[PDB]
């Protein structure tokens with residue numbers, strides 16, 4: 725029925741491949757996973773999703789120990805491939821992608837879902853350059869019956885993880901996703917990641933906490949988006965800006981063209 729044409733990327737459990745229909749020539753993205761409690765969780769979350777800034781999930785087929793997850797093929801590819809190394813991208817394009825990222829994250833948080841691994845590799849683009857949050861393999865429920873549950877599991881990607889995840893036994897889900905969006909914004913505006921990890925043993929992170937914004941990547945960033953990044957990349961998650969307040973930010977609301 726299908727045929728694995730090209731590899732689109734690889735995760736912890738399974739691989740994502742470009743599948744072209746043997747009859748219709750319809751090209752889709754298929755996540756092929758071998759072997760359980762996590763794929764049942766992932767399928768459950770994928771069926772809950774319905775938003776313009778979240779990848780479309782078609783369905784799932786099981787073949788013994790093999791699990792197939794059918795998803796929307798994003799023709800524009802990844803946000804990662806739009807970032808020019810050491811440069812980034814034009815500020816109006818970065819603003820628009822950030823507005824769309826916030827829209828997708830507000831939606832997820834609104835249904836009580838935390839993504840837990842936001843990065844340019846899983847932010848995909850459709851034919852009209854609309855951003856779509858993909859890869860729900862680490863996603864979990866942080867709110868149910870209007871009651872918040874604290875996270876305790878270590879997961880994500882070190883340059884994108886919030887510092888409380890490395891320090892605290894339990895932490896709130898929403899500030900962790902806000903933090904990763906901040907690193908994505910830095911990547912879009914500088915074409916460079918600021919640190920290997922947000923720990924005191926990492927010089928670049930110590931430099932940021934000491935406000936050495938005359939250093940890269942910060943010196944490449946204009947004063948307005950840099951003021952926003954100062955509010956996002958705050959060590960104490962209880963003092964960190966929330967998405968309702970990000971929506972009131974000067975740069976977030978700055979009219980930009982071309």
Ligand SMILES: C[C@@]1(N2CCN(c3cc4cc(NC(=O)[C@H]5CC56CCOCC6)ncc4cc3Cl)CC2)COC[C@@H]1O
Nearest residue numbers: 732733734735740753796797798799801845846858859
């Ligand atoms: C594990 C990681 N990844 C794996 C790939 N993955 C997906 C990749 C997809 C990729 C695409 N579309 C394309 O690649 C566009 C460019 C073309 C043009 C058309 O032809 C085909 C290639 N569409 C849908 C996808 C759906 C998903 Cl879910 C996201 C998660 C995250 O961290 C490291 C890895 O990158």
